[PDB]
Structures are given as C-alpha cells and as structure tokens.
C-alpha cells in the first residue's frame, strides 16, 4: 500500500 513516497505526495497535495 502506502510507502514514504505516497505519504510525501500527500504533502504537496494539501500544501
């Protein structure tokens, strides 16, 4: 499922 990359992609979605 979610890896560090996917979590990081979220950071640029909410910001």
């Amino acid at each position: 499922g979610i890896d560090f990359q996917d979590e990081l992609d979220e950071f640029f979605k909410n910001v």
Partner: antibody
Framework: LVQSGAEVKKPGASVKVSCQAS????????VHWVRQAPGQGLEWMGI????????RYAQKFQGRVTMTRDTSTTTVYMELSSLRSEDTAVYYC???????????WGQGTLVTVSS | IVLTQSPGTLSLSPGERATLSCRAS???????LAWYQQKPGQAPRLLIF???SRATGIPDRFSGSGSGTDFTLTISRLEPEDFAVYYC???????????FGPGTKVDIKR
C-alpha cells in the same frame, strides 16, 4: 546523475548548479540536494517534486535557496544566494527511493567562494 | 531531529565484527532511519533503509536493526572494501525532514 562542474563564485553572490538525469530515472521520482563541507558531514537542503516545483527547503537555507525542475531537458537546478565562506562545499543531487533514502547520487559540484 | 553517532572512529582489523550506534533525540516515525557508507573521493552510497531492510547490491554482512531512538549497524566480518565513513539519516514525510548524523570512520587497525 551528471551534475555541473566546479563553480568559483564570490562572497555575497549566487550559484546555480545543475543535475541532468534520465527521465526514466527522474520524471516519476523525487530528487534531493545535499552539501558536504570540506572534511565535514552531509546536510540536506531541499526536495524537488516529481513534476512541479513542490519544493520543501531547509531552515538553515530558507530564503537563500531555490530549486527548479525542467521537464524539457529532464534537469534539476539548485540556486544558492548570499554566498559565504561557510557555504564552500561539494553539493550533490540524489534521487529519493519509494521508501525515502537516496539510492542514486551524483558526482558532486565543488562551490568555492573566494576572490 | 538531531542524530548522534558513536563512536567517532572505529579502529578494527579485517575479518572482525563492527557495531555503530545512532542515538536520536526523538522517536523516528515508521522507524525511518537509513545507514550510508561514503568512500573517500566518492559520493555516499545507501546501505540499509528502514533501520532493518537492506537495499539492492548490499551484502549480507551489513546488518541493521533499530527502533525509536536507538539504532545500530553491524558488520559480521570486516573486509577491506567495508572500511569507510558511515552515516545515519532520519527521514520523515510530513514535513520532509531528512537529517544526518555526524559520521563514524572505520579504519584498519595497526
């Protein structure tokens, strides 16, 4: 990960280092910029997004750094302003893996600041 | 967010075991700590990621384990190709942190 050559800037000036790569190994992956002072450790500076300039800079280099990506030439650029003696170091560009740590680094670019 | 490495210089002979420790100030999320090896004149090369997962091309002699604030990198048998400087790095996703340790140099005992 081929990078730019040695750069001899002056104190208080700015430097722009390049990191050209293959889009197969970079268009779908994140890139990071690190520096190593002569004889010291590694210092993370920022992260460039897989496409746009979704950069997250470091506090020590906040306001004096600017990272950009060019999808036409598949290159990543780093610009540092207000150069000082403490900024003389070899800068590296590394691609982030799906898990976080950087797997493929670059040759490095020595950024000397003097007369 | 601040990583400390002990020792600063590991004087060991080839064939021996090596233990490098990395103490953090806080807990690393998802045990997101990686160990790197940097050879003189070369760029750093990833050795272990996730505190205990090995990367591609890394030998089984290099073994990693850690949790929270205490992490360790072990080498079963030291070979001449393993003598270099090792670094530990903490990585986070929100917000991206990416902090390194001071650095431990493993040299040939004499």
């Amino acid at each position: 990960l081929v990078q730019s050559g040695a750069e001899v800037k002056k104190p208080g000036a700015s430097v722009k280092v390049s990191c050209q790569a293959s889009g197969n190994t970079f268009t779908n992956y994140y890139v990071h910029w690190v520096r190593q002072a002569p004889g010291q450790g590694l210092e993370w500076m920022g992260i460039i997004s897989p496409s746009g300039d979704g950069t997250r800079y470091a506090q020590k280099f906040q306001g004096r750094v600017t990272m950009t990506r060019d999808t036409s030439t598949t290159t990543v650029y780093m610009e540092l302003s207000s150069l000082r003696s403490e900024d003389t170091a070899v800068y590296y560009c590394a691609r982030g893996s799906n898990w976080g740590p950087w797997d493929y680094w670059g040759q490095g670019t020595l950024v000397t600041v003097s007369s | 967010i601040v990583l400390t490495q002990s020792p600063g210089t590991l004087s060991l002979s080839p064939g021996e075991r090596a233990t490098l420790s990395c103490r953090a100030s806080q807990s690393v999320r998802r045990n997101y700590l990686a160990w790197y090896q940097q050879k003189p004149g070369q760029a750093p090369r990833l050795l272990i990621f996730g505190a205990s997962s090995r990367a591609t091309g890394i030998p089984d002699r290099f073994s990693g384990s850690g949790s929270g604030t205490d992490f360790t990198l072990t080498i079963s048998r030291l070979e001449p190709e393993d003598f270099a400087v090792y670094y530990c790095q903490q990585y986070d996703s929100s917000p991206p942190i990416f902090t390194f340790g001071p650095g431990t140099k493993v040299d040939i005992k004499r």
